[PDB]
């Protein structure tokens, strides 16, 4: 059993390496196979898995015909989170019955999510007095407000969306809780074109540098 144990350990190390290569750990797998000939064979694979921060369950029944393969059906369960768009995207992929694009989209969504949470934690750590946790580091939006003067506030909203083909893309927009007192004070009125300008600035020099410069201007 020693040689078998060593071979199993080597295979387990290989499986862990591949799991790191995909970023997804499949906890369980149950296989069933039936044959229905007039040679059609239906195979059902139940599996629970998880990405870095997320856990999922899914089962799918696929058909193989004597030399084509196509998934007959599938069901899939997420966990309840704020990002309800993930659930509707899961549903849409369920009608699409597509797996590879679904998993790549989920990994990309978590990769952007981890990036967003890490950036939020870093900016909160940098300046913890001008950074307010409106809903949390794992939320969609952040808000910077001056403690001495609560009239101003600036909220950056970040939402990750999925294209119909399966492409993923983030989106960031600004909004200012600004009194008309300050608007009356200065007649320059550049806040009208603020969203597009800030988007261009972020595209020029990223998100973290943009927010760092923004909070530097708030000194």
């Amino acid at each position: 059993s020693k040689d078998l144990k060593n071979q199993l350990g080597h295979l387990e190390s290989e499986l862990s390496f591949l799991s790191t290569l995909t970023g997804i750990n499949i906890r369980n797998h149950s296989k069933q196979t039936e044959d229905l000939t007039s040679r059609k064979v239906l195979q059902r694979h139940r599996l629970s898995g998880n990405c870095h921060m997320v856990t999922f369950q899914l089962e799918f029944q696929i058909l193989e015909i004597q030399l084509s393969s196509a998934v007959t059906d599938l069901n899939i369960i997420m966990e309840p989170t704020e990002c309800s768009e993930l659930s509707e995207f899961v549903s849409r992929a369920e009608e699409r019955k597509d797996l590879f694009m679904f998993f790549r989209s989920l990994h990309f969504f978590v990769e952007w999510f981890e990036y967003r949470k890490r950036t939020f934690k870093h900016l909160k750590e940098k300046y913890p007095d001008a950074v307010y946790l409106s809903e949390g580091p794992s939320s969609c939006s952040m808000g910077i407000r001056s403690a001495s003067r609560p009239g101003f506030e600036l909220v950056i909203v970040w939402r990750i969306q999925i294209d119909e083909d399966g492409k993923v893309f983030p989106k960031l927009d600004l909004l200012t809780k600004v009194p008309q007192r300050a608007l009356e004070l200065d007649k320059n009125r550049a806040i009208e074109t603020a969203p597009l300008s800030f988007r261009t600035l972020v595209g020029l020099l990223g998100i973290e540098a943009a927010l760092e410069s923004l909070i530097k201007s708030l000194c």
Binding site: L4, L8, L18, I26, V71, L99, D165
Partner: protein, 198 residues
């Protein structure tokens, strides 16, 4: 006892490996590298899967591969093969999936809906450009050209359909022209073909 537990663990990890094969991509570690298997599918239709050999040594080299050459990878290799290998694999997976979907749409059209087609379709190996002609039954002739210049997606960005030899006489004809334009620009090919033909 111990043998039974070892067998149970082995069959569990084998089932997990099969599940890993059934999703995303596959990889089988070898002595000289990993013969990484990439899987392709579209609209719940399993498609042909490829594989590429790897060398784990620092001078990263591809000593063997099965991906067709017309898919650009050497530029992507210079881009992200040395650095951020994960993005390299994700991008190549997307590109192969898009190519497989395009080829599946093309040969599905050739095999199934050739009934209303009046001529062979001209297709590139990468299937970025498609040019064909079709008759729909009143009977109207059309000739369509699709530009899949966005390589990462399976949907064209610019499509143009027209006819030569007939002068415009019915606004309804231009209406079906625009409808087909939108159908190619938005929805898959065989799907909209089965949609209007039926």
């Amino acid at each position: 006892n111990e043998q039974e537990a070892l067998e149970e663990k082995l069959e569990n990890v084998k089932a997990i490996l099969q599940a890993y094969h059934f999703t995303g991509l596959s990889g089988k570690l070898t002595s000289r590298g990993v013969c990484v298997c990439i899987s392709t599918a579209f609209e719940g239709n399993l498609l042909d899967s490829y594989f590429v050999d790897l060398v784990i040594q620092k001078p990263l080299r591809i000593h063997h591969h099965s991906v067709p050459v017309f898919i650009p990878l050497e530029e992507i290799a210079a881009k992200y093969l040395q650095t951020n290998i994960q993005h390299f694999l994700f991008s190549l997976c997307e590109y192969l999936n898009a190519y497989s979907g395009r080829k599946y749409q093309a040969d599905r059209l050739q095999s199934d809906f050739a009934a209303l087609l009046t001529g062979p379709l001209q297709r590139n190996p990468l299937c970025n450009l498609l040019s064909f002609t079709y008759k729909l039954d009143q009977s109207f002739p059309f000739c369509a050209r699709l530009l899949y210049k966005d390589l990462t997606a399976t949907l064209p960005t610019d499509v143009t359909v027209t006819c030569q030899g007939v002068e415009v006489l019915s606004t309804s004809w231009e209406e079906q022209r625009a409808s087909h334009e939108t159908l190619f620009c938005t929805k898959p090919l065989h799907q909209v073909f089965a949609s209007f033909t039926r």
